[PDB]
Amino acid sequence: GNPNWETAQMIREYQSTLEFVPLLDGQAVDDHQITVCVRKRPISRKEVNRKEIDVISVPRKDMLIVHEPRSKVDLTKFLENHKFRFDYAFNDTCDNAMVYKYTAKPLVKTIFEGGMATCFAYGQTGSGKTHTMGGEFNGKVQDCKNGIYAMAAKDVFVTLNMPRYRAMNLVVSASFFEIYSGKVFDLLSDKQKLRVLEDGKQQVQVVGLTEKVVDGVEEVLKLIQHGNAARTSGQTSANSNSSRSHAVFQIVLRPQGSTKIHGKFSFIDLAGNERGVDTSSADRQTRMEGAEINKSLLALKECIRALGKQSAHLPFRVSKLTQVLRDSFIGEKSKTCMIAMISPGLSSCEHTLNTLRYADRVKELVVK
Amino acid sequence: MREIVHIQAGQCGNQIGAKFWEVISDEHGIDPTGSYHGDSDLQLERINVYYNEATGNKYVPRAILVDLEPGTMDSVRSGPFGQIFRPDNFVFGQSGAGNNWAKGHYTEGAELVDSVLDVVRKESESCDCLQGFQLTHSLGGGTGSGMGTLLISKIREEYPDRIMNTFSVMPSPKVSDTVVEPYNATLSVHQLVENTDETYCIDNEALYDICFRTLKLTTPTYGDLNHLVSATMSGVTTCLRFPGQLNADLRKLAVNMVPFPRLHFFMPGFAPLTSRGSQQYRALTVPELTQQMFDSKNMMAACDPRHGRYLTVAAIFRGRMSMKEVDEQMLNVQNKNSSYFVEWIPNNVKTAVCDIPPRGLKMSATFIGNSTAIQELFKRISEQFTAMFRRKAFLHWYTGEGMDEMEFTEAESNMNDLVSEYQQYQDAT
Amino acid sequence: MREIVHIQAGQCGNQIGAKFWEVISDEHGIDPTGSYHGDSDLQLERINVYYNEATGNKYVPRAILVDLEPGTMDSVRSGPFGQIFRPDNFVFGQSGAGNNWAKGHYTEGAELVDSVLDVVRKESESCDCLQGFQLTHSLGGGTGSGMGTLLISKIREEYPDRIMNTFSVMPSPKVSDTVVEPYNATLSVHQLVENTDETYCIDNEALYDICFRTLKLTTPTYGDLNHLVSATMSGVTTCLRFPGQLNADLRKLAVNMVPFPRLHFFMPGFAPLTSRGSQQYRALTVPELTQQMFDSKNMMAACDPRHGRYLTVAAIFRGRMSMKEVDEQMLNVQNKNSSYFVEWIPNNVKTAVCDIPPRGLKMSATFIGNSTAIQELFKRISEQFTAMFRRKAFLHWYTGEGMDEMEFTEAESNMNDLVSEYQQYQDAT
Amino acid sequence: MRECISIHVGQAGVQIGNACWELYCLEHGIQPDGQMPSDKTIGGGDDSFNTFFSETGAGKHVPRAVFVDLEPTVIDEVRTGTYRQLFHPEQLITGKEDAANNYARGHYTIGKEIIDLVLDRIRKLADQCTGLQGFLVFHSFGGGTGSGFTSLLMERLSVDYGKKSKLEFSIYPAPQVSTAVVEPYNSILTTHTTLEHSDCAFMVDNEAIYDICRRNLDIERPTYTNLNRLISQIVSSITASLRFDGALNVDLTEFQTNLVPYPRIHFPLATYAPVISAEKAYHEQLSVAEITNACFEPANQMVKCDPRHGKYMACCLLYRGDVVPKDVNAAIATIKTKRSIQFVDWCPTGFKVGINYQPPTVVPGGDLAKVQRAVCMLSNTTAIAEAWARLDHKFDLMYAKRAFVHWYVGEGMEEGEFSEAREDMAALEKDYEEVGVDSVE
Ligand SMILES: CC(=O)O[C@H]1C(=O)[C@@]2(C)[C@H]([C@H](OC(=O)c3ccccc3)[C@]3(O)C[C@H](OC(=O)[C@H](O)[C@@H](NC(=O)c4ccccc4)c4ccccc4)C(C)=C1C3(C)C)[C@]1(OC(C)=O)CO[C@@H]1C[C@@H]2O
Ligand SMILES: CC(=O)O[C@H]1C(=O)[C@@]2(C)[C@H]([C@H](OC(=O)c3ccccc3)[C@]3(O)C[C@H](OC(=O)[C@H](O)[C@@H](NC(=O)c4ccccc4)c4ccccc4)C(C)=C1C3(C)C)[C@]1(OC(C)=O)CO[C@@H]1C[C@@H]2O
Ligand SMILES: Nc1nc2c(ncn2[C@@H]2O[C@H](COP(=O)(O)OP(=O)(O)OP(=O)(O)O)[C@@H](O)[C@H]2O)c(=O)[nH]1
Ligand SMILES: Nc1ncnc2c1ncn2[C@@H]1O[C@H](COP(=O)(O)OP(=O)(O)NP(=O)(O)O)[C@@H](O)[C@H]1O
Ligand SMILES: Nc1nc2c(ncn2[C@@H]2O[C@H](COP(=O)(O)OP(=O)(O)O)[C@@H](O)[C@H]2O)c(=O)[nH]1
Ligand SMILES: Nc1nc2c(ncn2[C@@H]2O[C@H](COP(=O)(O)OP(=O)(O)O)[C@@H](O)[C@H]2O)c(=O)[nH]1
Ligand SMILES: [Mg+2]
Ligand SMILES: [Mg+2]
């Protein structure tokens, strides 16, 4: 309605004193083998009706700044520039969905180049991340023509149909898992636990898995449905469905019947987190659950703080998912990336900021 | 208040408790019958932590004796305190593991664990609120190796957020009392890294050096070896039973003493330790005990602490003391020996002060350290392990019980990562 | 006040009462002669429920002993309490059923039931007002199977609105003590579904497990097996004899414990049960008894209650207690085990508190449950039944006594509907 | 009559609480059964003051006491000791688990289901009072309840009681000796809310009061019984203005306007004059100018810090007993004369004199004895900035190595809360640079 408008007067002054190099989805997104990208959701019509104030600058292609109001020791307003050098800094206005393609392009190569090209989706509740990987891209009714996975699950058959890659006698195969309750449940069986061990070559060896073949870009979506048809875990009407399962979408590439693997993907879904202390456990059940998550997520960046550094030692064993993905952290031809999703709330700045603290341990470097 | 369930596995483990449960009852003043006849009432203030009440003024120790595979059983019943356990808690079977891991964890454990886990839930709901699961067993053997680790997989599953300590007697690097001793170490610790909060890694050779070099004893019997270990146990739960000016929960230890969720392998320590008649030529002070605690020949770990780096230590002090002397002696050690420690940790020592000593003494202490000097021990076992497996030595007593070759490769690389990620932190970084 | 007629059928049934009638007289303090020598007068307040007066201060148990087919008779007379029954109530015949149903219900019963039903009406009109018809017998055998069900067809006809309990010892699914045991089960229960208000379905294998696993007994005799059953009977009519702060009629049970007029097949339970000398290491409280009552190995039913769903349970408590502890322990069980019960019933538990314990104890209890876990038992008998009938095994001992083939098809489909309509309610709907 | 509300948060506060109320009942002639048989003989005075006490119809006097520690082990010494029948038996034990020295278990996971038992118990006790509410919170840093439960206590009482007085006495950890290794983590996570809600934040230290027991008291063996009695003398040298007839009685609110220049910088760093032994009561006069000059020395501080590396902003001299005001102002310009203790430009005035004419009394059973006069300087400085450099560098040491973090992240807190608490202390300790640097022209 009418918050402090001078809040916005503080914002615009930094804007009209500098260059700004925006970034759109109409350019060749080059390759690095590693990154952490960004994409925010647009300001809603409601937030405008409530006069929500801008909080972001997009000064550059690989950097973003937050506009935090503060106060001094005489109640004088102060503004902070949260200078965050990152790799890819996309706007909420530029959502043409090529971000996935620009993220897929390096990865669509690797498995077909014989490598382990993985990813993760990281973001706050209501930050638009279910609109970012699970699809579809319309923002209205999730119209079943723009499945964001299908923008490279097309590639699974179309880049397969690449005559350069038609030479390779390769099979379609993949696997969905459930990292939850400190255990591994199958999304194909799909109520049973499996166990996973290593090889003399320090591979990974699942025990009792269903490996599914498909000639359908929707047949894999059926297994995402049938995979989600477990509808686990921790379901309620809270966060949001709260059916929080760290949903592994892993790929199994090899020849027709040779049993010899020529690469991998693993694209993983974040769980359903709880907004600080706003939730309630009221049970030793839930008091376990979020604790397991908030550790299991934290340890992930650590071996990446070992691998993205880069370093040598690597403790993949505190989390089973890193025991699943100890493989991925080792290959030289093994890409990785991860995505940030943001909400324009000013109350969200307390959490969209805690979002970004998690990815900073690459030791990015602002030269400004 | 919080209460503690006490579990015993292996032929070793209940023999530890058989002296140990005598110590606690003498710490409060309780007969073989359960009739309390202590001196003061201050020992009555936390009876509930181990002992629950019975009908006529009787106290029953909450001890679930899994390891009474029948030869070991009658000795416990025909002991000094066979008339103190509730006889329905003697949960056991027939024709035991036979120093086989798979006969402890895969075949006979499945014919006993349903009879065990129920009796766990019996004493569980008789408690107001739980934290304590003190498993007393050894590595290397049978029941303590396969049947011991089976409960720790299960009781963690029914109780995800409870304190899990296992005071496991480790193998010895020179005195090998078991031919299959590396094959029981690698498998059982592979459970322990996954599902323990802390453990008290104890060797017998360290107990051998302490009883002979320090206590000057001619013939140390296993009751006298374990009485050293029994001193560790009662010292740690001193503050959860007695009012202290700086208290010590198990969880207060189990947030301070562990930096990283995997590295929770502890070495204990105890002082005073002397050999005398009734005239001994010394004087008990705070720097008297302090120098004794940090001695390389006063470890129950069988390693040189000066070879590794202390990650963190725990000084749990008992008896009447003075905090400044306690503070500055812990200060002076971190000063004069700063090159020993992990340097990139601000404080490397914590304290804990109970206010009541044991019966005979006037002051006492309990050292608990966690070092990169225990990096030696698993290196002194995994090398013994990897010589047996390349020649594929004892496989037909294991593959014929329900195991697999891929299980052994999975087992050691768990242990290979600990010694690898102790080298990261013994290095000056 | 209301009074109870007590009937015994079968070789099993009077052997149950022979210990049981000793218990009631010792519950009040009555000699073998009928001379009352109890301690207080509170046990005198409801003598009339079982015992009517005689000439000089003597009390006579209203027990009509149908089953004294003459071999069983003299043992009852040459027992501890042969000098307590009115000898005209020994109603019997010659050349009995011989473990044949039709020889109990069709041929020799017609030559005895007119001598029985009159003696029923004798003790009937000596009562002020009736409710109680406690038939004590077994299934599986002879007199308890054919002659037992004959009275229940008749006494219901003369007394349509009276409480009808039969504490029938059921067959055992493994220990088969009778070759024709499924043929006596299917026929006699076909009477019981039609004309009983409640029944206490009891197995001997459940009595076998209780006497051995829990009571730790070497050689359980049938006096000691049935003494467990005798504890059930006196516990239920405790409140109809003793003043309790939450009373318990048979009909108060027989409106609460039954949802639907056909499904009235109950399993009993009892606590405390222990093995000791005189020192036992426990303590009697309300949560002490509560956990013991709901145990799968503390059922007299020989089934896993966790396999089925409890429709409803009945906690009949004796001795001095506290209602909040009684309330919350029944509350906590329905909370922690809510997936076990029938979920679409608001409260799944009721209580009943008498104020007077038995002689030796200080507190006691009596569990009565009704479950879809008894769906197992008739399934474990009707499968044994249907293997005999397809080969038409023992028909010439039945068709030659006045039966028909169409009677057997009619008999099992009654029983086939109970297991069918227990599947409707063990399902989560 | 004005009043004060005592909340001894956690185990350090209860040990302090064992002596504070002990000292008061000795001052007001009160036995441990709440009676006053001494003024039954005299028959005058309301000396069981509405400052700290109520009175039932039998004459038994009841404190304004309440205390929470989340573990029954500490409070049972009270409920079995000499002070069993003194307090009202709603002493909130209620801990099914000790907080285990982390902030998260703590403000987040187990502070719930206990705080509603606390705040309700407060407002029952608050309605016994007529006028000035003074919260006196007694917590340490480093402990679980002293940091976790304290941070819950402020943002709930700040809503339920508006803008009344909050006097919270934080035991600040030493830059040299810490009895806990995770203690630098608790001592920064509380600072996100200690800075915001709390009115006045005292600091003391053990390593300062250890030196004083060997130097001024001359005892080689200090125990917490003899440590906390000096902090007990600090409080009684404050609240005596709310109790006793003094030449310049000073309300708690008079502290607040004076000692707090800017709304966040309230850290006023108490001292005392404890040179008693009591052989050194002889060989020594201890006039006004004698005990005034004790405030000079960095060896007389209660915080292990040199005052000579910054500026002062405000001071508060509070005198007890046989004090003459002309002797005060003599002992003031001498402190203005010395150019080493130095002020800022923007506070040319400086001091504030408060004078009771009732001296403190002797705690029997050791250690000190009857001195005729006393002093409690209350003075924030800019020198307290470098004590936080002696804590943040400890904090930033074990942050890069991701230590101790799973017992915070898995207990209801995000890892983003740590860099929130870091940039709080990064911004706050930066602001002390803005104070001493004066705007020259
Ligand atoms: C005259 C005198 O002071 O004798 C001492 C004594 O000489 C010494 C050598 C004792 C003695 O201990 C041993 O010789 C010993 C034997 C087997 C295993 C371990 C030790 C002593 O036996 C042990 C005994 O310990 C206790 O009384 C403690 O309360 C101890 N109790 C038991 O271990 C115990 C023993 C038997 C039955 C019940 C309990 C304890 C320690 C920690 C926690 C709980 C209890 C003490 C002080 C002494 C003797 C009697 C000689 C020492 O041990 C202890 C545990 O105090 C050995 O080094 C210390 C130093 C003592 O000064
Ligand atoms: C020293 C002491 O306390 O001894 C107890 C005893 O040890 C235990 C083990 C008793 C004992 O019972 C049995 O061993 C037993 C034998 C056959 C069948 C069933 C039980 C006891 O015999 C049984 C006896 O029971 C009674 O006195 C009741 O009043 C009981 N009476 C009879 O069953 C009875 C027996 C013989 C003659 C007349 C009556 C009763 C129970 C319900 C309703 C009415 C009466 C009691 C408490 C004990 C002994 C004596 C050892 C237990 O049984 C009962 C019924 O109380 C078995 O588990 C309980 C727990 C008792 O503590
Ligand atoms: N001066 C003084 N310091 C104390 C006292 N008790 C504890 N401390 C200090 O306080 C810190 C430990 O915090 P405690 O107050 O004991 O912990 P707590 O608040 O009870 O929290 P938990 O025990 O963790 O639940 C250490 O720095 C101790 O030196 C005391 O009585 N006096
Ligand atoms: N990038 C985007 N562009 C346009 N609209 C968007 C975008 N992201 C989200 N929206 C719209 O914002 C609304 C909320 O998005 P949604 O993906 O449902 O949120 P969420 O993060 O899944 N919330 P929740 O399930 O409650 O935790 C929907 O109406 C979307 O269509
Ligand atoms: N400290 C100690 N060690 C023991 C004891 N008994 C056996 N051991 C050790 O335990 C291991 C053998 O296992 P044991 O417990 O006897 O086998 P189990 O009965 O199959 O569990 C070896 O390392 C022995 O040295 C004992 O009483 N005390
Ligand atoms: N519990 C119990 N069961 C009995 C007893 N006597 C016989 N039975 C059981 O009763 C059945 C045999 O019937 P029984 O009463 O002896 O035959 P009847 O005389 O023809 O009625 C079998 O299932 C036996 O196991 C007894 O005294 N107690
Ligand atoms: Mg959503
Ligand atoms: Mg505490």
mmCIF file of C-alpha atoms in Angstrom, chain A residues 81-206:
data_model
loop_
_atom_site.group_PDB
_atom_site.id
_atom_site.type_symbol
_atom_site.label_atom_id
_atom_site.label_comp_id
_atom_site.label_asym_id
_atom_site.label_seq_id
_atom_site.Cartn_x
_atom_site.Cartn_y
_atom_site.Cartn_z
ATOM 1 C CA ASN A 81 25.674 -3.730 -1.521
ATOM 2 C CA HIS A 82 25.882 -7.502 -1.017
ATOM 3 C CA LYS A 83 28.448 -7.910 -3.784
ATOM 4 C CA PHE A 84 28.153 -11.569 -4.817
ATOM 5 C CA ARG A 85 30.501 -12.578 -7.610
ATOM 6 C CA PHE A 86 28.905 -15.719 -9.056
ATOM 7 C CA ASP A 87 29.116 -17.397 -12.480
ATOM 8 C CA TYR A 88 25.693 -16.847 -14.119
ATOM 9 C CA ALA A 89 23.347 -14.035 -13.051
ATOM 10 C CA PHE A 90 20.010 -14.276 -14.875
ATOM 11 C CA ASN A 91 17.044 -11.984 -14.287
ATOM 12 C CA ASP A 92 13.498 -12.920 -13.357
ATOM 13 C CA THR A 93 12.305 -10.992 -16.428
ATOM 14 C CA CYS A 94 14.418 -12.992 -18.909
ATOM 15 C CA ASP A 95 12.828 -16.389 -18.257
ATOM 16 C CA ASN A 96 12.684 -17.866 -21.768
ATOM 17 C CA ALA A 97 13.564 -21.349 -20.408
ATOM 18 C CA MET A 98 16.791 -21.568 -22.430
ATOM 19 C CA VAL A 99 18.499 -21.387 -19.020
ATOM 20 C CA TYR A 100 17.929 -25.128 -18.745
ATOM 21 C CA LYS A 101 19.153 -25.532 -22.321
ATOM 22 C CA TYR A 102 22.169 -23.328 -21.603
ATOM 23 C CA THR A 103 22.638 -25.487 -18.506
ATOM 24 C CA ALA A 104 21.931 -28.712 -20.429
ATOM 25 C CA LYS A 105 24.269 -28.093 -23.406
ATOM 26 C CA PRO A 106 27.502 -28.765 -21.447
ATOM 27 C CA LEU A 107 25.862 -31.688 -19.654
ATOM 28 C CA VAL A 108 24.184 -33.257 -22.712
ATOM 29 C CA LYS A 109 27.730 -33.625 -24.072
ATOM 30 C CA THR A 110 29.389 -35.236 -21.056
ATOM 31 C CA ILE A 111 27.440 -38.494 -20.715
ATOM 32 C CA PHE A 112 27.656 -38.861 -24.497
ATOM 33 C CA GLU A 113 31.329 -37.933 -24.149
ATOM 34 C CA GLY A 114 31.582 -40.592 -21.427
ATOM 35 C CA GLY A 115 31.263 -38.690 -18.160
ATOM 36 C CA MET A 116 29.256 -37.926 -15.036
ATOM 37 C CA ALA A 117 27.314 -34.679 -15.574
ATOM 38 C CA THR A 118 25.177 -33.917 -12.526
ATOM 39 C CA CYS A 119 23.149 -31.062 -11.084
ATOM 40 C CA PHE A 120 20.938 -29.858 -8.249
ATOM 41 C CA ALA A 121 18.092 -27.354 -7.789
ATOM 42 C CA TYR A 122 18.438 -25.119 -4.715
ATOM 43 C CA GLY A 123 15.997 -22.423 -3.655
ATOM 44 C CA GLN A 124 13.535 -21.084 -1.120
ATOM 45 C CA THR A 125 9.856 -21.961 -0.774
ATOM 46 C CA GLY A 126 7.784 -19.926 -3.205
ATOM 47 C CA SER A 127 10.921 -18.914 -5.121
ATOM 48 C CA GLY A 128 9.641 -20.540 -8.323
ATOM 49 C CA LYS A 129 11.855 -23.625 -8.382
ATOM 50 C CA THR A 130 9.062 -26.119 -9.028
ATOM 51 C CA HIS A 131 8.444 -23.802 -11.996
ATOM 52 C CA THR A 132 12.155 -24.148 -12.867
ATOM 53 C CA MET A 133 12.884 -27.892 -13.230
ATOM 54 C CA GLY A 134 9.673 -29.869 -12.770
ATOM 55 C CA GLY A 135 7.901 -27.857 -15.454
ATOM 56 C CA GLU A 136 5.940 -26.934 -17.382
ATOM 57 C CA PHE A 137 6.846 -23.397 -18.472
ATOM 58 C CA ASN A 138 3.652 -21.417 -18.724
ATOM 59 C CA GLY A 139 3.189 -20.206 -15.147
ATOM 60 C CA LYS A 140 -0.602 -20.645 -15.394
ATOM 61 C CA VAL A 141 -1.700 -24.310 -15.430
ATOM 62 C CA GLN A 142 1.566 -26.193 -16.129
ATOM 63 C CA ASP A 143 0.695 -26.927 -19.750
ATOM 64 C CA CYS A 144 2.099 -30.323 -20.764
ATOM 65 C CA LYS A 145 4.280 -29.119 -23.637
ATOM 66 C CA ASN A 146 7.193 -27.410 -21.821
ATOM 67 C CA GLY A 147 8.459 -30.006 -19.363
ATOM 68 C CA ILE A 148 11.764 -28.438 -18.398
ATOM 69 C CA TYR A 149 13.347 -31.876 -18.199
ATOM 70 C CA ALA A 150 12.006 -32.537 -21.708
ATOM 71 C CA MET A 151 14.073 -29.606 -23.008
ATOM 72 C CA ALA A 152 17.026 -31.999 -22.663
ATOM 73 C CA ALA A 153 15.085 -35.253 -22.346
ATOM 74 C CA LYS A 154 14.371 -34.341 -25.942
ATOM 75 C CA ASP A 155 18.160 -34.383 -26.319
ATOM 76 C CA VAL A 156 18.171 -37.890 -24.798
ATOM 77 C CA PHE A 157 16.555 -39.012 -28.063
ATOM 78 C CA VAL A 158 17.416 -36.098 -30.351
ATOM 79 C CA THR A 159 21.099 -35.726 -29.497
ATOM 80 C CA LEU A 160 21.013 -39.514 -29.532
ATOM 81 C CA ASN A 161 19.687 -39.140 -33.077
ATOM 82 C CA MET A 162 22.800 -37.053 -33.740
ATOM 83 C CA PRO A 163 24.524 -39.114 -36.490
ATOM 84 C CA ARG A 164 27.813 -38.441 -34.702
ATOM 85 C CA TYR A 165 26.267 -40.358 -31.780
ATOM 86 C CA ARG A 166 24.295 -42.854 -33.867
ATOM 87 C CA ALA A 167 27.616 -44.695 -34.222
ATOM 88 C CA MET A 168 27.480 -45.507 -30.506
ATOM 89 C CA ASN A 169 25.398 -48.643 -29.882
ATOM 90 C CA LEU A 170 23.922 -47.185 -26.717
ATOM 91 C CA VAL A 171 20.832 -48.038 -24.669
ATOM 92 C CA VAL A 172 18.328 -45.829 -22.862
ATOM 93 C CA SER A 173 18.321 -46.420 -19.115
ATOM 94 C CA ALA A 174 18.004 -44.535 -15.852
ATOM 95 C CA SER A 175 17.067 -44.864 -12.185
ATOM 96 C CA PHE A 176 15.068 -42.948 -9.561
ATOM 97 C CA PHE A 177 15.927 -43.241 -5.847
ATOM 98 C CA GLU A 178 14.761 -41.849 -2.505
ATOM 99 C CA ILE A 179 17.374 -40.472 -0.103
ATOM 100 C CA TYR A 180 15.246 -40.084 3.009
ATOM 101 C CA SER A 181 15.233 -41.290 6.621
ATOM 102 C CA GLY A 182 18.930 -41.991 6.121
ATOM 103 C CA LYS A 183 17.986 -44.759 3.691
ATOM 104 C CA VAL A 184 17.614 -45.546 0.000
ATOM 105 C CA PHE A 185 14.167 -46.550 -1.254
ATOM 106 C CA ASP A 186 13.356 -47.393 -4.855
ATOM 107 C CA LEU A 187 10.931 -45.250 -6.843
ATOM 108 C CA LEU A 188 10.368 -48.193 -9.225
ATOM 109 C CA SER A 189 9.735 -51.183 -6.945
ATOM 110 C CA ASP A 190 8.792 -48.849 -5.140
ATOM 111 C CA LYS A 191 8.419 -49.507 -1.393
ATOM 112 C CA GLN A 192 11.638 -51.500 -0.877
ATOM 113 C CA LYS A 193 15.090 -50.537 0.370
ATOM 114 C CA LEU A 194 18.242 -51.246 -1.618
ATOM 115 C CA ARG A 195 21.894 -51.205 -0.593
ATOM 116 C CA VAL A 196 24.761 -49.742 -2.609
ATOM 117 C CA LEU A 197 28.448 -50.687 -2.468
ATOM 118 C CA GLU A 198 31.630 -50.008 -4.430
ATOM 119 C CA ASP A 199 33.839 -51.850 -6.931
ATOM 120 C CA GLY A 200 37.541 -52.589 -7.240
ATOM 121 C CA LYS A 201 37.555 -49.556 -9.542
ATOM 122 C CA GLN A 202 35.664 -47.640 -6.808
ATOM 123 C CA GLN A 203 32.444 -47.599 -8.798
ATOM 124 C CA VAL A 204 29.021 -47.852 -7.144
ATOM 125 C CA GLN A 205 27.002 -51.075 -7.050
ATOM 126 C CA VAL A 206 23.298 -50.851 -6.253
#
